[PDB]
């Protein structure tokens, strides 16, 4: 078992589940036997640290479309770029 | 749509990683083909 690192998109792997995302300080309350957390669409949302009884939110590390704004080429070759739904940092 | 990610469509598992990590590529390819066909059809249904 390696160390656990937070707030970066990582390849996490707990007892039997793999995934990719951001592990953050949860605040949900697991039942003292509960390990995982599923979302409304049966998708993982939190985990229990198998070496420390604390709970971690999981978030999909950011993705989005990349759109290229442009006046017609025969007007210019200059383009702007929109990264949808991402924060101007992750880019 | 999202719930359709949780179906085998005949494969041994709906988890792509587990299919990958349990089987040798000649057979994992077949199971993954079943998964891809199922999920692709789920998208086509959604889009229609």
């Amino acid at each position: 078992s390696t160390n656990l690192v937070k707030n970066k998109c990582v390849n996490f792997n707990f007892n039997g589940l793999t995934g990719t995302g951001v592990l953050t300080e949860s605040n949900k309350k697991f039942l003292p036997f509960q390990q995982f957390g599923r979302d409304i669409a049966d998708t993982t949302d939190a985990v229990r640290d198998p070496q420390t009884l604390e709970i971690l939110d999981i978030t999909p590390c950011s993705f989005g479309g990349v759109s290229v704004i442009t006046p017609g080429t025969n007007t210019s070759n200059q383009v702007a770029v929109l990264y949808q739904n991402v924060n101007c940092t992750e880019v | 749509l999202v719930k359709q990610l949780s179906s085998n469509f005949g494969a041994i598992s709906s988890v792509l990683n587990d299919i990958l990590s349990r089987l040798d590529k000649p057979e994992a390819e077949v199971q993954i083909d079943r998964l891809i066909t199922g999920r692709l059809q789920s998208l086509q249904t959604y889009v229609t």
Binding site: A41, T43, P60, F63, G64, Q84, N85 | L1, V2, L5
Partner: peptide
Amino acid sequence: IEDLLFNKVTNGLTVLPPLL
């Protein structure tokens, strides 16, 4: 009335924001 109305209505997927 527009306020009443706005109150009374309540993985690779992304949602785009309306232009207006």
